[PDB]
Design a protein around this nucleic acid. Structure first.
Ligand SMILES: CC[C@H]1OC(=O)/C=C/[C@H](C)[C@@H](O[C@@H]2O[C@H](C)C[C@H](N(C)C)[C@H]2O)[C@@H](C)C[C@@H](C)C(=O)/C=C/[C@H]2O[C@@H]2[C@]1(O)CO[C@@H]1O[C@H](C)[C@@H](O)[C@@H](OC)[C@H]1OC
Ligand SMILES: [Mg+2]
Ligand SMILES: [Mg+2]
Ligand SMILES: [Mg+2]
Ligand SMILES: [Mg+2]
Ligand SMILES: [Mg+2]
Ligand SMILES: [Mg+2]
Ligand SMILES: [Mg+2]
Ligand SMILES: [Mg+2]
Ligand SMILES: [Mg+2]
Ligand SMILES: [Mg+2]
Ligand SMILES: [Mg+2]
Ligand SMILES: [Mg+2]
Ligand SMILES: [Mg+2]
Ligand SMILES: [Mg+2]
Ligand SMILES: [Mg+2]
Ligand SMILES: [Mg+2]
Ligand SMILES: [Mg+2]
Ligand SMILES: [Mg+2]
Ligand SMILES: [Mg+2]
Ligand SMILES: [Mg+2]
Ligand SMILES: [Mg+2]
Ligand SMILES: [Mg+2]
Ligand SMILES: [Mg+2]
Ligand SMILES: [Mg+2]
Ligand SMILES: [Mg+2]
Ligand SMILES: [Mg+2]
Ligand SMILES: [Mg+2]
Ligand SMILES: [Mg+2]
Ligand SMILES: [Mg+2]
Ligand SMILES: [Mg+2]
Ligand SMILES: [Mg+2]
Ligand SMILES: [Mg+2]
Ligand SMILES: [Mg+2]
Ligand SMILES: [Mg+2]
Ligand SMILES: [Mg+2]
Ligand SMILES: [Mg+2]
Ligand SMILES: [Mg+2]
Ligand SMILES: [Mg+2]
Ligand SMILES: [Mg+2]
Ligand SMILES: [Mg+2]
Ligand SMILES: [Mg+2]
Ligand SMILES: [Mg+2]
Ligand SMILES: [Mg+2]
Ligand SMILES: [Mg+2]
Ligand SMILES: [Mg+2]
Ligand SMILES: [Mg+2]
Ligand SMILES: [Mg+2]
Ligand SMILES: [Mg+2]
Ligand SMILES: [Mg+2]
Ligand SMILES: [Mg+2]
Ligand SMILES: [Mg+2]
Ligand SMILES: [Mg+2]
Ligand SMILES: [Mg+2]
Ligand SMILES: [Mg+2]
Ligand SMILES: [Mg+2]
Ligand SMILES: [Mg+2]
Ligand SMILES: [Mg+2]
Ligand SMILES: [Mg+2]
Ligand SMILES: [Mg+2]
Ligand SMILES: [Mg+2]
Ligand SMILES: [Mg+2]
Ligand SMILES: [Mg+2]
Ligand SMILES: [Mg+2]
Ligand SMILES: [Mg+2]
Ligand SMILES: [Mg+2]
Ligand SMILES: [Mg+2]
Ligand SMILES: [Mg+2]
Ligand SMILES: [Mg+2]
Ligand SMILES: [Mg+2]
Ligand SMILES: [Mg+2]
Ligand SMILES: [Mg+2]
Ligand SMILES: [Mg+2]
Ligand SMILES: [Mg+2]
Ligand SMILES: [Mg+2]
Ligand SMILES: [Mg+2]
Ligand SMILES: [Mg+2]
Ligand SMILES: [Mg+2]
Ligand SMILES: [Mg+2]
Ligand SMILES: [Mg+2]
Ligand SMILES: [Mg+2]
Ligand SMILES: [Mg+2]
Ligand SMILES: [Mg+2]
Ligand SMILES: [Mg+2]
Ligand SMILES: [Mg+2]
Ligand SMILES: [Mg+2]
Ligand SMILES: [Mg+2]
Ligand SMILES: [Mg+2]
Ligand SMILES: [Mg+2]
Ligand SMILES: [Mg+2]
Ligand SMILES: [Mg+2]
Ligand SMILES: [Mg+2]
Ligand SMILES: [Mg+2]
Ligand SMILES: [Mg+2]
Ligand SMILES: [Mg+2]
Ligand SMILES: [Mg+2]
Ligand SMILES: [Mg+2]
Ligand SMILES: [Mg+2]
Ligand SMILES: [Mg+2]
Ligand SMILES: [Mg+2]
Ligand SMILES: [Mg+2]
Ligand SMILES: [Mg+2]
Ligand SMILES: [Mg+2]
Ligand SMILES: [Mg+2]
Ligand SMILES: [Mg+2]
Ligand SMILES: [Mg+2]
Ligand SMILES: [Mg+2]
Ligand SMILES: [Mg+2]
Ligand SMILES: [Mg+2]
Ligand SMILES: [Mg+2]
Ligand SMILES: [Mg+2]
Ligand SMILES: [Mg+2]
Ligand SMILES: [Mg+2]
Ligand SMILES: [Mg+2]
Ligand SMILES: [Mg+2]
Ligand SMILES: [Mg+2]
Ligand SMILES: [Mg+2]
Ligand SMILES: [Mg+2]
Ligand SMILES: [Mg+2]
Ligand SMILES: [Mg+2]
Ligand SMILES: [Mg+2]
Ligand SMILES: [Mg+2]
Ligand SMILES: [Mg+2]
Ligand SMILES: [Mg+2]
Ligand SMILES: [Mg+2]
Ligand SMILES: [Mg+2]
Ligand SMILES: [Mg+2]
Lengths: 110, 117, 147
RNA sequence: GGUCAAGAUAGUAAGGGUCCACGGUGGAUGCCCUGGCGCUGGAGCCGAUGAAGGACGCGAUUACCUGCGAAAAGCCCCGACGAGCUGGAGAUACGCUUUGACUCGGGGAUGUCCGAAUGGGGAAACCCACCUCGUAAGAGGUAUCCGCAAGGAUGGGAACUCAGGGAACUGAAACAUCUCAGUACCUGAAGGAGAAGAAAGAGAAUUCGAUUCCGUUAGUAGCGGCGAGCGAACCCGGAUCAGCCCAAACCGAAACGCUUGCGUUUCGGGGUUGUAGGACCAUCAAGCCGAAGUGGCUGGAAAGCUACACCUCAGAAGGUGAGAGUCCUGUAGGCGAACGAGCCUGAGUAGGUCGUUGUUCGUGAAACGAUGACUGAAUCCGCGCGGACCACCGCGCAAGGCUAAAUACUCCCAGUGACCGAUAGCGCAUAGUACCGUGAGGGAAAGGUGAAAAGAACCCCGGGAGGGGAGUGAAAGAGAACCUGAAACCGUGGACUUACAAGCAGUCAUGGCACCUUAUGCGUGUUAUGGCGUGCCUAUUGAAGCAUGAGCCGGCGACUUAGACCUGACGUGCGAGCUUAAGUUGAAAAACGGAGGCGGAGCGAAAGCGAGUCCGAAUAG
RNA sequence: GGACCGAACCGGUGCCUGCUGAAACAGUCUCGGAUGAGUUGUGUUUAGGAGUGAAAAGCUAACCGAACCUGGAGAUAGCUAG
RNA sequence: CAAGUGAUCUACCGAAGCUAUGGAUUCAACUCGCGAAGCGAGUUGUCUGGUAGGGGAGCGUUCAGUCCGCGGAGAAGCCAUACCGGAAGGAGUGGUGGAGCCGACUGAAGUGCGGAUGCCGGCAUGAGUAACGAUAAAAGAAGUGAGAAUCUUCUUCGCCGUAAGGACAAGGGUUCCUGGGGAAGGGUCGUCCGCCCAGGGAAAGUCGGGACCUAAGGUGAGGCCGAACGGCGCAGCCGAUGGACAG
RNA sequence: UAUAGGGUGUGACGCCUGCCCGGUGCCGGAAGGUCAAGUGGAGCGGUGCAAGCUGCGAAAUGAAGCCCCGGUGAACGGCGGCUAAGGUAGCGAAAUUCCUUGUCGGGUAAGUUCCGACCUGCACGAAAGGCGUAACGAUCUGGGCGCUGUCUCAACGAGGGACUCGGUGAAAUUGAAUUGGCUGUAAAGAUGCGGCCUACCCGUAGCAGGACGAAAAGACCCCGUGGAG
């Protein structure tokens, strides 16, 4: 059945990080990474929004409503930023948290 | 490499089915019977292309000696007497149309009656 | 085809005649005259081999063949300097071009970019040169005469 | 205008017909890959420490699959990775995780019951015991066969290997010999291969030098109801290449052998052969690092277009709203582990007779090997062989063993493809399932919303099903009976038409009516009347035939592939000369390789002679 | 008492009916046996040129002058179709 | 009142035979581009029914290399069509469709369907026909429900009664009970059901079996045979259909 | 364990069971003929100088078996033509008889059947048994009584279908169909060709003459250098 993501199941960003869409609608928009889904390659962000009319199941709501909620994307929001736009990024060095590498583009860290 | 029939059969088939047009019953909607009808239609076509010329010969002849008998002649007699008169060589088509213009066919009858006395 | 024995009655069932279910008339059965693995290779006469390759080179000399004289200057192995070298030898960005040489580095600017199909010595073949426009034959053994 | 008369003609459609238009059925065709297929290469045994294959269980919730095994979608240690995870599952709730989870590489530990099963029985997964340890709960033992004992064997395994056994259809245009064929099949033994192997040989050079496999000799030499047909080897070219140990004469026993310094099985030394020797006496597994693009434009959305620009040992490839070198994932290159893979020299023998058989070996002049019954020797001026047999000449040393590699196969893994792409491709886009059979056994079809569930809250008719709106979306001309969506087949509407008529259904001709987007002489559709007119195919002397075949449409569906084969035509390269095979080296491609094959001389039964040769005593063919 | 009549039971005589059946062997009516060479249950043994058979070439898992399944195997097809 | 018939004379009809006009093919000759035949031709003469069969030129499908390019302002496929070519066939335009694809040259084929009582699948005709599965009948009232000839309740009626009642073994496998359901199965219906969903129900010292026994038969240490696998066989062991045994 | 067991044919019971051992089988005989391997090894040949090594092979002898002799029938068998023998009893136009419905008689109005006689037995006959036989028989054959829808000869009535309405809804078959009669012609039996006649369109209930109607690639027949028992 088609198989899942081919990106070696590797997300290019954490759930913490700020990020910007670089394609489709919402290109240029930015937000925090509210949900990362590496194996399915999917990214929750406060950018994309969608009005999900959950079907009324009277589950405390006899008549149903229409919630406004953000609908996830994938490796099309671009990674972290720093000179105010998306960037390719590189593994760095040790810090006072010396067990860690950070990131940079043509610049500093994230 | 495989090379299944794909597009080809349907296209020949549609060519026959479109030749079908107003063919009664399956003759126009099922391929095989349309094809077979067109075999016999070939027969009829070529032979009629021949026949139609016998047909119009016959019709002009009918009209020509009808006019010839309007004046007391007949096709045998009128055609021969015209032939005897410095060979007129009007076609049988053309002699009919002069059976739509009576004053002339009349003089052709008098002329054939001449070269014959 | 992996299918059985003798399906039903040879005679008197009112059906058609058949006997097993593994046959080209049956959907699911075998193929008559299907392809099998096989060879295709043969020994073309040797004199025609060398004659062809020579006519190949020749047909290129009649318009645009080129002879790399005992080395090009390409800094280290960087491709960018191959692109400069070829641009200064009139190899635009346009024509697809073939290249033959022996030093590792000069080919290690072998990044076909609508450019630079690459062979060593003895790799030459009528196909690979006839396949390209200009031939940047390596001038050295390009005319070290045989025998 | 009115009546009467005579005559001519219109419209009506129960229904039907041709054409058009719009749907429904159905799932062809196009696109696609979640799945196959082959070739190449790699890798190749599991099990009494329990295999292969199963049963029954393990989940908050579990029917199926996966994983596990009462310590049960799991437990412990090490390495890796560094934010997720909470299996497929698309499900809510409980939660776990920088103290490094999860996933990946490696080890340990747990591992019910059945199954070689093996405490005993048994209708597989169950029923019944006994012995020891234990407070019980629980733990351990209890099969036969080799061994003193350590220890080993039972079983399983696609194809491959060896072996005991061993068909017929079929060809011979019938059929016995012969062939199919030592094929199919059964059975045994084993391994990652096995087999075979170190000349009592091949063979006619006083040459070679284990075995195996490939080319070649060669369809030669031969075998053959001399029919059908079967069919070698030597030389020569390559892949690969090693040969090593015993029993025996002779020493030291030691035990049991006997009239007295000896002789049957043992243990060291010693000794291992033919140009006779020995004696005794002078790198790969997990993984990490990895160069380079921004603006404008059409778009629902950009990777597309365009303007400038960059990298390149990296333009292989996938992914991302349509096609991205520079957005993501990336062997181009680079690094990488705890700790894990790699005087003697062989007797019931050689030899023989009887019955047979292998080898090209069909009893043939039949050697030789191999044997089932009976018999039965020599040993270095010795013994076997050179295709009845003899002599000479020549090649070998049986009657003891072991032995890598070149060889085969594909359950498994990776890469590749003038292979497939949903009637194809494995039977399976997954199921040996559903279904059929007491059984052995047989055995299906089946794919597709959208980029993203944003999967349609709310409203209307309906018990529902179904639908109409609204809303999401580029699109609902995608709405879950969810890509396209042909044809048969069923319907609705419309044009033109049909209720005096005889019909292979068409064809020609003309009139009428209708419409004008390859299209106003032009047609196109329909229609009335006239003429003409015996479906198709097969099989046949002869088919409309009351002779075969077929309900209709769609898709599947039949002159191919092979071999240094043969013989022709055309074309190409060399040309009195022409070409390689097996293989070796390089492969983003080819080159090498004269072993050998074909021209080159013919006549003959053969010797053989040779522009000549055969018959034959020279004249003839 | 391989005696009689006759239910159960075992059977299958003649007619009709059924014949894309209610049923791949039946139904109603009628008829044979019915203490015997009888009927029947469970367990079990004999099979393919083989078994069985108060004997028809019967039966051997719904069509037995040699069962079924798989395999040789794409047997062979001077024949018919295409 | 020849449209009968013997002789005779003419005029006309009448075929795809002959002819006129146009044009194409086969072969032959004559002319030319070339540098070589022969290609493309142009002219005249000429030829041109056809089964098995020989020969020649070609059309179309998939796949491959190369070129040229098209595509979301829309590919292929599908549909209509009066255009074009000598044929196979090809293009234009419009409609659908939603992402891949023409043309040219060369190469390779699983390459061209009406037939095979061919194969798989779909849909027709027979036809709203035959049938609805024992000739043991059914009637009314009341109830429930969206909806009842068919479900429930009441009262009658008819049918079996060595059964068409009842209890078991075999076999089946939750079909049992309750509460719901109503797509499909039910030969019609359906509110019902042996159907679908969920939950519950099944209790043994004494009944049957086992921890007891032996029959036919099976199996079998040792033992007797046998190309293999294997065949026999004493004791023993297994085996109820029978023996033993407390409600 | 011979009063038993196997095989074979006959088939309660009664009277019985004839002629033919040439051929075949079986049983017995044994002077002679014949007959394998083996024993025997006269002699013939190759090769070698030789010793010797070697190919072939004759008489005599050598079993069973067969030729030869005898017997054998509830052994296979035979019992006739205008051979070894040729039908003893019984029965006979028969489950056997061709000519045939033989001839006579019985039964009937009338008897190709059936009963009885005869014999001229195409082609009866004695354990593949002959001829009888009470009783038995869903046996087969011919008569009689009784009774009746079997019939002259059909009627009336019943129920279950068939018919009409509402529900569910098949099948075999189907080249396509706008699918008449006569006569003629055609591969010789015409809706479909020719001529002539007849006939407005469409159904429903019914009948079975055609559509060489349907079903099973004729089981007869021939063919195949086909198959099987
Ligand atoms: C009527 C009863 C059966 O038919 C026949 O006997 C015979 C029918 C034809 C007349 C005959 O044709 C004739 O052949 C001749 C050789 C030639 C002749 N030509 C000249 C035309 C032809 O006319 C045959 C061969 C034709 C062929 C299709 C066939 O084989 C038919 C077979 C069976 O279906 C039939 C039955 O109807 C089934 O009845 C069965 O009876 C059993 C007792 C029941 O238990 C039941 O079985 C469960 C039932 O069903 C099976
Ligand atoms: Mg004419
Ligand atoms: Mg297949
Ligand atoms: Mg009037
Ligand atoms: Mg109407
Ligand atoms: Mg693949
Ligand atoms: Mg296991
Ligand atoms: Mg649980
Ligand atoms: Mg499980
Ligand atoms: Mg435990
Ligand atoms: Mg860890
Ligand atoms: Mg991780
Ligand atoms: Mg998930
Ligand atoms: Mg056990
Ligand atoms: Mg044990
Ligand atoms: Mg056991
Ligand atoms: Mg033969
Ligand atoms: Mg085996
Ligand atoms: Mg084994
Ligand atoms: Mg060699
Ligand atoms: Mg760009
Ligand atoms: Mg020997
Ligand atoms: Mg011998
Ligand atoms: Mg012979
Ligand atoms: Mg010898
Ligand atoms: Mg020998
Ligand atoms: Mg010799
Ligand atoms: Mg020796
Ligand atoms: Mg393809
Ligand atoms: Mg398939
Ligand atoms: Mg399909
Ligand atoms: Mg079943
Ligand atoms: Mg089953
Ligand atoms: Mg999807
Ligand atoms: Mg609603
Ligand atoms: Mg709804
Ligand atoms: Mg819609
Ligand atoms: Mg759609
Ligand atoms: Mg559908
Ligand atoms: Mg729906
Ligand atoms: Mg729906
Ligand atoms: Mg799509
Ligand atoms: Mg669709
Ligand atoms: Mg209307
Ligand atoms: Mg209409
Ligand atoms: Mg009219
Ligand atoms: Mg007409
Ligand atoms: Mg004939
Ligand atoms: Mg004819
Ligand atoms: Mg007909
Ligand atoms: Mg016909
Ligand atoms: Mg038919
Ligand atoms: Mg050759
Ligand atoms: Mg009695
Ligand atoms: Mg019986
Ligand atoms: Mg009965
Ligand atoms: Mg009685
Ligand atoms: Mg009685
Ligand atoms: Mg037998
Ligand atoms: Mg049977
Ligand atoms: Mg059955
Ligand atoms: Mg058979
Ligand atoms: Mg066959
Ligand atoms: Mg064979
Ligand atoms: Mg045969
Ligand atoms: Mg002419
Ligand atoms: Mg002309
Ligand atoms: Mg001309
Ligand atoms: Mg002609
Ligand atoms: Mg011609
Ligand atoms: Mg478009
Ligand atoms: Mg394509
Ligand atoms: Mg077209
Ligand atoms: Mg798209
Ligand atoms: Mg084909
Ligand atoms: Mg067809
Ligand atoms: Mg045809
Ligand atoms: Mg049929
Ligand atoms: Mg069908
Ligand atoms: Mg009925
Ligand atoms: Mg109410
Ligand atoms: Mg009631
Ligand atoms: Mg009722
Ligand atoms: Mg009831
Ligand atoms: Mg009440
Ligand atoms: Mg009861
Ligand atoms: Mg039970
Ligand atoms: Mg109930
Ligand atoms: Mg219902
Ligand atoms: Mg439901
Ligand atoms: Mg119903
Ligand atoms: Mg209903
Ligand atoms: Mg209930
Ligand atoms: Mg016991
Ligand atoms: Mg016993
Ligand atoms: Mg036994
Ligand atoms: Mg016993
Ligand atoms: Mg009991
Ligand atoms: Mg008791
Ligand atoms: Mg008890
Ligand atoms: Mg009690
Ligand atoms: Mg008898
Ligand atoms: Mg007698
Ligand atoms: Mg008489
Ligand atoms: Mg008689
Ligand atoms: Mg009388
Ligand atoms: Mg009388
Ligand atoms: Mg009679
Ligand atoms: Mg008498
Ligand atoms: Mg007699
Ligand atoms: Mg007798
Ligand atoms: Mg008798
Ligand atoms: Mg008598
Ligand atoms: Mg009796
Ligand atoms: Mg009778
Ligand atoms: Mg009587
Ligand atoms: Mg009535
Ligand atoms: Mg009519
Ligand atoms: Mg006639
Ligand atoms: Mg007639
Ligand atoms: Mg006609
Ligand atoms: Mg007629
Ligand atoms: Mg009328
Ligand atoms: Mg009838
Ligand atoms: Mg018939
Ligand atoms: Mg036939
Ligand atoms: Mg035969």
């Amino acid at each position: 059945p088609s198989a899942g993501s081919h990106h070696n199941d590797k997300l290019h960003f954490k759930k913490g990080d700020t990020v910007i869409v670089l394609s489709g609608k919402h290109k240029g928009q930015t937000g925090k990474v509210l949900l990362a889904l590496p194996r399915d390659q999917k990214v929750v962000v406060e950018g994309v929004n969608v009005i999900t009319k959950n079907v009324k199941p009277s589950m405390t709501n006899p008549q149903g409503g229409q919630e406004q909620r953000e609908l996830a994307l994938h490796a099309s929001k671009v990674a972290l930023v720093d000179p105010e736009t998306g960037k390719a990024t590189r593994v760095r060095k040790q810090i006072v948290d010396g067990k860690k590498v950070r990131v940079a583009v043509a610049s500093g860290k994230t | 490499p495989r090379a299944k029939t794909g597009i080809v059969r349907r296209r020949r088939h549609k060519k026959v089915l479109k030749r079908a047009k107003g063919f009664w019953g399956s003759r126009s909607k099922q391929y095989r019977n349309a094809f077979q009808t067109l075999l016999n239609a070939a027969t009829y076509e070529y032979r009629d292309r021949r026949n139609k010329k016998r047909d119009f010969r016959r019709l002009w002849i009918q009209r020509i000696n009808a006019g010839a008998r309007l004046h007391g002649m007949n096709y045998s007699t009128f055609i021969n007497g015209l032939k005897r008169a410095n060979i007129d060589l009007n076609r049988k088509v053309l002699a009919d149309i002069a059976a739509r213009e009576p004053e002339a066919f009349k003089a052709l009858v008098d002329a054939s009656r001449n070269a014959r006395q | 085809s992996k299918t059985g024995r003798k399906m039903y009655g040879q005679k008197g069932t009112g059906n058609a005649r058949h006997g097993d279910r593994s046959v080209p008339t049956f959907v699911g059965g075998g193929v008559a005259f299907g392809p099998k693995p096989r060879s295709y290779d043969y020994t073309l006469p040797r004199q025609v081999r060398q004659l062809g390759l020579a006519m190949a080179i020749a047909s290129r000399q009649e318009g645009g063949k080129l002879v790399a004289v005992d080395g090009f200057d390409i800094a280290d192995a960087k491709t960018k300097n191959f692109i400069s070298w070829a641009k200064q030898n009139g190899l635009d960005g346009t024509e697809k071009v073939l290249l033959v040489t022996d030093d590792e580095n000069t080919r290690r600017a072998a990044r076909n970019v609508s450019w630079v199909s690459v062979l060593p010595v003895a790799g030459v073949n009528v196909y690979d040169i006839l396949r390209h426009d200009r031939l940047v034959i390596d001038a050295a053994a390009l005319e070290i005469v045989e025998e």
